[PDB]
């Protein structure tokens, strides 16, 4: 039980940190589309392409 515990705890820690690195490093690249999606949302809310 403790063996199945220490291993899963260690890999959990190392995967949490790796996913943190994924998160911070992929956080801002998708903001290239936030402008155009805001634009299409405005177009939907107005009922015109503007």
């Amino acid at each position: 039980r403790v063996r199945a515990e220490q291993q899963v705890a260690s890999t959990l820690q190392t995967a949490h940190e790796q996913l943190k690195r994924e998160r911070d490093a992929v956080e801002l690249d998708l903001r290239a589309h936030v402008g155009t999606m805001s634009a299409t949302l405005a177009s939907r809310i107005l009922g015109v392409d503007l």
């Binding site: 039980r1 199945a4 515990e5 291993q7």
Partner: protein
């Protein structure tokens, strides 16, 4: 007296043999239990892994 003297050792060897048989059966279902318990151990380990 002669017949009681022979019956004593007769019952003695009979008890010896049957007791050896019983302790052999015990040493058998002992490792049976050991098998079952280590199986439960590994299945619990994999459960915690998942």
């Amino acid at each position: 007296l002669a017949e009681a003297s022979q019956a004593h050792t007769k019952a003695l060897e009979d008890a010896k043999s049957e007791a050896h048989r019983v302790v052999e059966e015990a040493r058998t279902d002992a490792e049976r239990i050991a098998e079952q318990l280590e199986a439960q151990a590994d299945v619990e380990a994999e459960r915690i892994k998942m």
